[PDB]
Amino acid sequence: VVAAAEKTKQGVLYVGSKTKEGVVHGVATVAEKTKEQVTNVGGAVVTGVTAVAQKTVEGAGSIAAATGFVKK
Amino acid sequence: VVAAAEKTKQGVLYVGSKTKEGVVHGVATVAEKTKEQVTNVGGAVVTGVTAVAQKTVEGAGSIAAATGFVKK
Amino acid sequence: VVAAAEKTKQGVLYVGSKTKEGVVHGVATVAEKTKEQVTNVGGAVVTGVTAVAQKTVEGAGSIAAATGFVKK
Amino acid sequence: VVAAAEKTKQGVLYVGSKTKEGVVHGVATVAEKTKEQVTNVGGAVVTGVTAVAQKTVEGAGSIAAATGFVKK
Amino acid sequence: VVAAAEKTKQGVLYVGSKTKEGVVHGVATVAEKTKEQVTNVGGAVVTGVTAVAQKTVEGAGSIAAATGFVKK
Amino acid sequence: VVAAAEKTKQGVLYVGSKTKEGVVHGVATVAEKTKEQVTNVGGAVVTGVTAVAQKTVEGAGSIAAATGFVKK
Amino acid sequence: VVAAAEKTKQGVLYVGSKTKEGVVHGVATVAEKTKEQVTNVGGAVVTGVTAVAQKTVEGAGSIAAATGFVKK
C-alpha cells in the first residue's frame, strides 16, 4: 500500500441543481434480530445532495488507505 | 498495491439538473433475522443527487487502496 | 501504508443548489435486538446538503490512513 | 502509516445554497436491546448543510491517521 | 503514525447559505436497554449548518492522530 | 504519533448565513437503562451554526493527538 | 506523541450570521438508570453559534495531546 505522487518543473464553469423532496442514503446497515453487526469504514464516504468535487489535486496527491477484518 | 503518478515539465462548461422526488441509495445492507452482518468499505462511496466530479487530478494523483476479509 | 507527495519547482466558477425538504443520511447502523454493534471509522465521512470540495491540494498532500478489526 | 508532503521552490468563485426543512445525519448508531455498542472514530466526520472546503492545502499537508479495534 | 510537512523557499470568494428549519446531527449513539456503550473519538468531528473551511494550511501542516480500542 | 511541520525561507472573502430554527447536535450518547456509558474524546469536536475556519496554519502547525480505551 | 513546529527565516475578510432560535449541543451524555457514566475529554470541544477561527498559527504551533481510559 504505497502511493507516490510527484510533480517536477524547472474558464467558465458551472454546476447547478434544483431538487425538491430528496432523500439520500449513503452506507446503510439496516437489520432486525441479529447478534453481530460491524461497519468498518476505511475509504471515503461522500454523501449529500450536490456532492461536487472540482479541480482537485492540482499538484501532487497521495490517498493511500487500507482496512481489514479478522475474525477467528 | 503500489500506485505511482508523476508529471515532469521543463472553455465553457455546464452541468445542470432539475429533479423532483428523488430517492437515492448507495451501499445498502437490508436484512431480517440474521446473526452476522458485516459491511467493510475501503474504496470510495460517492452518493448524492448531482454527484459531479470535474477536472480532477490536474497534476499527479495516487489513490492506492486495499481491503480484506478473513474469517476462520 | 506510505503516502508521499512532492512538488518541486525552480476563472469563473460556480456551484448552486436550491433544495426543499432534503433528508441526508451518511453512515447509518440501524438495528433491533442485537448483542454487538461496532462502527469503526477511519476514513473520511463527508455528509451534508451541498458537500462541495474545490481546488483542494494545490501543493503536496498526503492522506495516509489505516484501520482494522480483530476479533478472537 | 507515513504521510510526507513537500513543496520546494527556488478568480471569481461562488457556492450558494437555499435549503428549507433540511435534516442531516452523519455517523449514526441507532439500536434497541443490545449489550455492547462501540463507535470508534479516527478519521474525519464533516457534517452540516453547506459542508464546503475551498482551496485547502496551498502548501504541504499531511493528514496521517490510524485506528484499530481489538477484541479477545 | 508519522506526519511530516515541509515548505522550503529561497481573488473574489463567496460561500452563501439561507437555511430554514435545519436539524443536523454529527456522531450519534442512540440505544435502549444495553449494558455497555463506548464512544471513542480521536479524529475530527466538525458539525454545523455552514461548516466552511477556506484556505487552510498555507504553509506546513501535520495532523497526525491515532486511536485504539482494546477489550479482553 | 509524531507530527513535524517546518517552513524555511531565506483578496475579497465572504462567508454568509441566514438560519432560522436551527438545531445542531455534535457528539451525542443518548441511552436508557444501561450500566456503563463512556465518552472518551481526544480529537477535535467543533459544533455550531456557522463553524468557519479561515486561513489557518499560515506557518508551521502540528496537531499530534492520541487516545485509547483499555478494558480488562 | 511528539509535535514539532518550526519556522525559520533569514485583504478584505468577512464572516456573517443572522440566526433566530438556535439550539446547539456539543458533547452530550444523556442517560437514564445506569451505574457508571464517564466523560473523559482531552482534545478540544469548541461549541457556539458562530464558532469562528481565523488566521490561526501565523508562526509555529504545537497542539500535542493525549488521553486514555483504563478499566480493570
Curated annotation (Swiss-Prot), chains A, B, C, D, E, F, G:
Sequence repeats: 17-31, 32-42
GO cellular component, one term: nuclear outer membrane
Subcellular location: Cytoplasm; Membrane; Nucleus; Synapse
First-to-last residue of the parent protein present: 15 to 97 of 140
Disorder named in the UniProt entry: Genetic alterations of SNCA resulting in aberrant polymerization into fibrils, are associated with several neurodegenerative diseases (synucleinopathies). SNCA fibrillar aggregates represent the major non A-beta component of Alzheimer disease amyloid plaque, and a major component of Lewy body inclusions. They are also found within Lewy body (LB)-like intraneuronal inclusions, glial inclusions and axonal spheroids in neurodegeneration with brain iron accumulation type 1. Parkinson disease 1, autosomal dominant: A complex neurodegenerative disorder characterized by bradykinesia, resting tremor, muscular rigidity and postural instability. Additional features are characteristic postural abnormalities, dysautonomia, dystonic cramps, and dementia. The pathology of Parkinson disease involves the loss of dopaminergic neurons in the substantia nigra and the presence of Lewy bodies (intraneuronal accumulations of aggregated proteins), in surviving neurons in various areas of the brain.
Protein name: Alpha-synuclein
Source organism: Homo sapiens (Human)
UniProt GO MF annotations: actin binding; alpha-tubulin binding; beta-tubulin binding; calcium ion binding; copper ion binding; cuprous ion binding; cysteine-type endopeptidase inhibitor activity; dynein complex binding
Entry similarity comment: Belongs to the synuclein family.
Region annotation (4 X 11 AA tandem repeats of [EGS]-K-T-K-[EQ]-[GQ]-V-X(4)) ranges: 6-42
